[PDB]
């Protein structure tokens, strides 16, 4: 599958990135996994162990093998104090097929939902599985969520309504589950609601971070849809937005402003949206050389946004610099709101996650087995 030509170009650009890292990073840790992960999410927990020079952090990872046994993994990592690093397996759980995406429940972080190459979305409570997985590889989810006909990626837990989960699928639908309901015994729960507003593969879904009834969806039909779970319709959203000129792959709500939303597309742009008036696209971020697949706001800075995708790059944006005049020289590198380009990966970035406890720290995973934990130099954002 490899392009020996492109590989030489990538490798030589990497060597240049590597020696530039002391300029650009306060922290760079790189780890090669046996298998690539399509998913990353930091767990909310952190601790500074007595008599140690590092902090303990946790990552939810997955595995991607077509041939062999897959696993849902929680990784323990050492993050060195500002006065290299280490990764270990906290727990490893047998998983049928690759883990498309894995998300922890905000109210109960040891509950993790996963998307699979099949239609069932699985739920795991990692406190209810053996410390070491049985080599037989039999996958025993605590819950199987029924409702989809095809696989997907989009996953979202309601952070205001415990146990409520959204999922997006290639079958054109968004499914809704309430995992606290169901029968006594007990493993299978059916979709409470199935939303069919889209006419193509729905790529991502996301609850509003403040209103428990609002969520957004995003599809290959180039539309952004805003839904209300109160309403007795599941075929028509509250708002239908012509968001992009190509497939929309991701969306992310700002954790500081209940009205603003970000959207990422195959048209190589990120769009800013305001929920109070969706006829007007607030802004367009341009710089990416290929399809954008993931977008996430910083959990510490309201004006900071990050995006990534097929161009092996991760871009960090600063909203507070939009419209700011640049010299003709600086304009060649991109618009004034482009803060930082991360060139540490040598293949497509599958997913990334902002560290919720250490400002500016990000974990990104690529298709060539690499996971990087990094933090850009203070000199770059401290202006």
């Amino acid at each position: 599958f490899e392009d020996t030509v492109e590989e030489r170009v990538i490798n030589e650009e990497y060597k240049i990135w590597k020696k530039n890292t002391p300029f650009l990073y306060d922290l760079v840790m790189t780890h090669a996994l046996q298998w690539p992960s399509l998913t990353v999410q930091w767990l909310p927990e952190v601790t500074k162990p007595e008599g140690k020079d590092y902090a303990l952090h946790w990552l939810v990872l997955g595995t991607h093998t077509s041939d062999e046994q897959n696993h849902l993994v929680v990784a323990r990592v050492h993050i060195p104090n500002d006065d290299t690093g280490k990764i270990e397996c906290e727990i490893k759980i047998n998983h049928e097929g690759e883990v498309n995406r894995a998300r922890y429940m905000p109210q109960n972080p040891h509950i993790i939902a996963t998307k699979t190459p099949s239609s069932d979305v699985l739920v795991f409570d990692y406190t209810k599985h053996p410390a070491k997985p049985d080599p037989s590889g039999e996958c025993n989810p605590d819950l199987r969520l029924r409702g989809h006909q095809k696989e997907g990626y989009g996953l979202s837990w309601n952070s205001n309504l415990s146990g409520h989960l959204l999922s997006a699928s290639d079958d054109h639908t968004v499914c809704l589950w309430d995992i606290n309901a169901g029968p006594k015994e007990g493993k299978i729960v059916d979709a409470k609601a199935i939303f069919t507003g889209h006419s193509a593969v729905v790529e991502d879904v996301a609850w509003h971070l403040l209103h428990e009834s609002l969520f957004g969806s995003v599809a290959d039909d180039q539309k952004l849809m805003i839904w209300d779970t109160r309403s007795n319709t599941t075929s028509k959203p509250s708002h239908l937005v012509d968001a992009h000129t190509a497939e929309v792959n991701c969306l992310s709500f700002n954790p500081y402003s209940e009205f603003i939303l970000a959207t990422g597309s195959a048209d190589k742009t990120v769009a800013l949206w305001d929920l109070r008036n969706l006829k007007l696209k607030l802004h367009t971020f341009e710089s990416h050389k290929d399809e954008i697949f993931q977008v996430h706001w910083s959990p510490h800075n309201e004006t900071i946004l990050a995006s990534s995708g097929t161009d092996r790059r991760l871009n960090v944006w600063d909203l507070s610099k939009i419209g700011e005049e640049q010299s003709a020289e600086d304009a060649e590198d991109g618009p004034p709101e482009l803060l930082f380009i991360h060139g540490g990966h040598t293949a497509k970035i599958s997913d990334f996650s902002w560290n919720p406890n250490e400002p500016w720290v990000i974990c990104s995973v690529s298709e060539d087995n690499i996971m990087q934990i990094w933090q850009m130099a203070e000199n770059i954002y401290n202006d």
């Binding site: 600086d330 991109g334 482009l338 930082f340 380009i341 991360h342 130099a377 000199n379």
Partner: peptide, 15 residues
């Protein structure tokens, strides 16, 4: 060389 802050900031945008 590219040690000043404006230069580092410009390196950052170039990746």
């Amino acid at each position: 060389q590219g040690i000043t802050k404006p230069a580092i900031r410009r390196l950052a945008r170039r990746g």
